[PDB]
Amino acid sequence: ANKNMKILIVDDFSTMRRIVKNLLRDLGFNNTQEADDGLTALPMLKKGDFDFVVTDWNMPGMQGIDLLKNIRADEELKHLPVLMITAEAKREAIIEAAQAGVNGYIVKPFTAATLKEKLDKIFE
Ligand SMILES: [Mg+2]
């Protein structure tokens, strides 16, 4: 796992964006940027050459599931591994996210410990 991989953190609650960001900082990943909704994350991915996406699942403008779909329908972006953040792991929403092509999921609140298992798991 390369620690200079360009990571996009997507979440509508800015405090959550900065917590995810410091957890990634504690793990060797410092190349992080932010977006507050999928509508604002999309143009960032579209032009920014990112390597990894961490997105919230429920956002007001465009949802986590709809950004993953747009990423997956975009020829240029379809190779992007996506980790989803969710308030509780309901079986039904996860299966849906799995079917939509997400790489993994993590339930909040979470720690740097969990985050890394999730990252290792995704990258295999
Ligand atoms: Mg949210």
Residue numbers in the entry: 5 to 128
Tell me, in the authors' exact words, what the paper reports:
Vibrio cholerae contains multiple copies of chemotaxis response regulator (VcCheY1–VcCheY4) whose functions are elusive yet. Autophosphorylated CheA then donates phosphate to the response regulator CheY. Phosphorylated CheY interacts with the flagellar motor protein FliM and influence the direction of flagellar rotation from counter clock wise (CCW) to clock wise (CW). As expected, both VcCheY3 and VcCheY4 possess (β/α)5 fold typical of the response regulators.
To investigate whether the hydrogen bond between T90 and Q97 affects the hydrophobic packing of W61, M88 and V106, we have solved the structure of VcCheY3-Q97A. As expected, the overall structure of VcCheY3-Q97A is almost identical to that of VcCheY3 and the Mg2+ ion bound at the active site occupies the equivalent position to that of Mg2+ (or Ca2+) of VcCheY3. Interestingly, even in the absence of the hydrogen bond between T90 and Q97, the conformation and packing of W61, M88 and V106 are found to be unaltered with respect to the wild type VcCheY3. However, the water mediated hydrogen bond between W61 and E100 is not seen in this mutant. E100 is slightly reoriented here and has moved toward the CD1 atom of the adjacent I69. These observations, coupled with the quenching results, point to the fact that although the hydrophobic packing of W61, M88 and V106 is independent of the hydrogen bond between T90 and Q97 in free state, in the absence of the later interaction, reorientation of W61 and M88 occurs more smoothly upon phosphorylation. VcCheY3-Q97A and VcCheY3-Q97A/E100A, on the other hand, showed considerable quenching in the presence of acP, suggesting that in the absence of the hydrogen bond between T90 and Q97 (and also in absence of E100), conformational alteration of W61 may take place more easily and it can move toward the surface of the molecule. The lower Km values of VcCheY3-Q97A and VcCheY3-Q97A/E100A are due to the loss of the coupling between T90 and Q97 which facilitates the movement of T90 toward the active site and stabilize the acyl phosphate. Furthermore, aforesaid biochemical data, in conjunction with the structure of VcCheY3-Q97A, indicated that the coupling of T90 and Q97 restricts the movement of T90 toward the active site reducing the stabilization of the bound phosphate and effectively promoting autodephosphorylation of VcCheY3.
